[PDB]
């Protein structure tokens, strides 16, 4: 087996299929960074750091020697446990299609939110600076009148163009801002139709973030280094419940500061 120890879990093959399908589509619904950043191939469970190529001054061993430490970006392991009812698991083989996978969906929503928040807002505990913090472009404020959103997106796009940044530009909207853009109509004309003619890329539903982001999808600017992609592992079980978990080992790196424009509300 592997570190997941999936073979030791009292879960039917049929139940495994339902659990894996639900976790997969639920994670994809809440996730949005994996649609604009460069996601690498899984490097394996041995992957523990990403070389940043930079040198770090360190005390020399003796005189006449110049010593430097090799800088690297560490990987963080995210593990979201959840508990399932063994009755719901055993019901799958008996023909049940309404088994309670809500703990599975909540773990997928949580892991997806942690990942997108790590990419865009940051994760200081893992030395991961967010895109918003690294954005060298002037941040903008979302207007109070939603009919003025095309104005702020247009200025954000011009900031990217004035910084020498190319590539198909995409706009990531938070759950509240996305709903606002979908419903707002300036004199009946829907403002999302206005935005669709301004964005050569896509307008992405990003529920984990807050505010909005305007970035490029040319590639080579945002790097999601995967060591271990999302997987379902087994922890423990009794005669009534099974403790599983969603696990992922990754880190994020932002190579181009001017490749993004952050947007936020006002307090």
């Amino acid at each position: 087996m592997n570190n997941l120890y999936r073979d030791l879990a009292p879960v039917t093959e049929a139940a495994w299929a339902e659990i894996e399908l639900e976790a997969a589509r639920t994670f994809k619904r809440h996730i949005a960074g994996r649609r604009v950043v460069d996601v690498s191939d899984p490097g394996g469970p041995v992957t523990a750091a990403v070389s940043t190529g930079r040198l770090i001054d360190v005390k020399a061993p003796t005189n006449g020697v110049i010593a430097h430490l090799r800088a690297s970006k560490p990987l963080v392991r995210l593990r979201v446990p959840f508990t399932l009812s063994r009755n719901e698991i055993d019901d799958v083989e008996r023909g049940s299609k309404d088994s309670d996978w809500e703990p599975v969906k909540e773990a997928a929503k949580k892991l997806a939110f942690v990942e997108d928040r790590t990419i865009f807002e940051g994760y200081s505990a893992a030395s991961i600076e967010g895109i918003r913090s690294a954005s060298s472009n002037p941040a903008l404020t979302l207007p109070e009148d939603p009919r003025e959103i095309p104005d702020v997106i247009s200025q954000a796009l011009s900031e990217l163009r004035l910084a020498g940044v190319d590539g198909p530009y995409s706009v990531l909207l938070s759950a509240d801002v996305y709903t606002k853009v979908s419903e707002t109509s300036d004199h009946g004309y829907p403002i999302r139709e206005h935005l669709n003619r301004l964005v050569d890329g896509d307008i992405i539903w990003a529920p984990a973030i807050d505010g909005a982001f305007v970035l490029t999808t040319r590639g080579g600017d945002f790097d999601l280094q995967l060591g271990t992609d999302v997987a379902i592992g087994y922890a423990s079980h009794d005669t009534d419940t099974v403790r599983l978990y969603l696990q992922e080992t990754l880190t994020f790196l932002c190579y181009t500061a001017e490749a993004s424009v952050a947007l936020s509300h006002k307090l």
Binding site: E20, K28, V36, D229
Partner: peptide, 9 residues
């Protein structure tokens, strides 16, 4: 599916 897969776009 299988847990999840990157590169969704």
């Amino acid at each position: 599916g299988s847990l999840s897969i990157g590169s969704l776009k």
